[PDB]
Amino acid sequence: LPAGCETAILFPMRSKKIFGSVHPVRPMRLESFSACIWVKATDVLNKTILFSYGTKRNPYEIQLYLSYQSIVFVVGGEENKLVAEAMVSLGRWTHLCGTWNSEEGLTSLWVNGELAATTVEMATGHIVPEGGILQIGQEKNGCCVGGGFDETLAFSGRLTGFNIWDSVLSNEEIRETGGAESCHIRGNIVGWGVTEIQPHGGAQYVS
Template structure:
């Protein structure tokens, strides 16, 4: 399915103390995000709190950033339960604790200089993998939650959609230290995300997505 041009969306600012709820599987429900700076990245930290009741064998898109020709940064839970991310080609796959109905804090770090990549769950780091040293994520794409665009602004499939809750999504253009990631996990004050800061994030809803209080 094609999704509307991002320029046609009505954007709103700020999700402090709010949760995005994707109540059921669709091929049209998603949230578009506007970064605070160009997504030309040689390093990043991406963090979010996420929960789902979808079965482990169901593939789920957790974050999607696509330019005209490439999936610049896609984060998935795979059909075999592993969590992965892809940058313009084959992905890196990690065996992590399962994402369940109880909210998990999930971070991903990567830097181009060494290629070192790791996921962090509940403040604990996975083993490092070396993935795409020397790579640069390209700017001028579209970032959405809830769907995987198989082409720029299109190609949405219900069987890959996210169903569940997402909150506290933040992103930095550098790798946060262990102490900072652990502080974020426990809800302590950390430097505001300079790409996405949940409290001031610019977002637009499409389809059946709810914004609810984080009780």
């Protein structure tokens, strides 16, 4: 048994240098998906970056950030967004997730297994290419240049359970993955404790 599945990372603070590198295996070609994470933040900012995907042409491919007391989920472009209202608390484990489907651009947020939002026609029909970079809580520009990254966009807190799916998991899957025994549940695109994750600049794993 997992006996209390607990493996995570370390963010001693938000600096200009600490970062991590994601290294998936299969193409990022995406039209629909699912993804979730258990989080324990310390302090929210004007825009606190948790994770996001980008490309040389579009560094804003995927995105999820917290500003004050709400959640905004962005896809492929700044205009493309999904704001929540009053469902974030500091320093508390929480289940959160959102999804997109190209075929007519559905989007839904889902927290603690509970629907946080519902809305349609975002990134509608768009095709996600593959060839960019994925990082968790950082931007792209600033590698091996002595910082560079905007410290203003960094995050403080704990994270655990990063997993990505090729398809929008049903709402039953949404509620169940929020259960006390969902840590083992690992996605197809990315599996927590399976996909390569190597820290940098002061990141370390914590159990």
